[PDB]
């Protein structure tokens, strides 16, 4: 399927134990996609002081469309040193590995896979 319904656990930035997906734009996008498929991907909502506490390159989910079954349509965009690789809508948050942190909420998304 070109799209997959996921429920992403929303983590508090200070709880996150693994703060990025790797060391290159291509690796973080690869790893983000693998974790999303394996249900081991968390979401951190971006506010002031969140991103400096995570590791670059960042992986964002961004709104790709204006929401089937409550799931917002999203796609992946990486950022490294202020350059983004991909073009999409509003940031829903930054993806991180999930390794058993307790979530504060769930974000229903439809991921363009």
């Amino acid at each position: 399927k070109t799209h997959v319904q996921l429920s992403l656990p929303v983590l508090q930035v200070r709880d996150v134990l693994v703060r990025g997906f790797g060391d290159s734009v291509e690796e973080v996008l690869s790893e983000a996609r693998q974790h999303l498929k394996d249900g081991t991907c968390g979401l951190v909502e971006v506010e002031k002081g969140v991103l400096p506490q995570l590791e670059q390159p960042y992986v964002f989910i961004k709104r790709s469309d204006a929401a089937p079954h409550g799931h917002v349509m999203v796609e992946l965009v990486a950022e490294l040193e202020g350059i983004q690789y991909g073009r999409s809508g509003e940031t829903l948050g930054v993806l991180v590995p999930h390794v058993g942190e307790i979530p504060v909420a769930y974000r229903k998304v439809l991921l363009r896979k």
Side-chain angles (χ1 to χ4, degrees), residues 25-98:
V25 159
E26 291 154 84
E27 186 179 14
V28 298
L29 283 168
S30 189
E31 285 292 335
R33 286 194 172 96
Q34 191 69 60
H35 279 84
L36 283 162
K37 172 231 169 103
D38 301 339
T40 56
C41 191
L43 181 62
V44 184
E45 293 182 335
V46 178
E47 296 176 352
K48 295 302 196 292
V50 166
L51 287 177
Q53 294 187 66
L54 297 172
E55 294 170 357
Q56 298 200 50
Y58 307 130
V59 173
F60 301 107
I61 44 157
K62 284 176 172 293
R63 200 190 207 88
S64 69
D65 185 14
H69 311 268
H71 294 255
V72 169
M73 295 192 48
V74 298
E75 57 198 349
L76 301 189
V77 174
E79 180 187 306
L80 177 61
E81 291 153 2
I83 303 169
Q84 295 197 333
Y85 300 73
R87 171 174 208 277
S88 194
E90 188 169 31
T91 295
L92 275 81
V94 50
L95 300 184
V96 297
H98 189 208

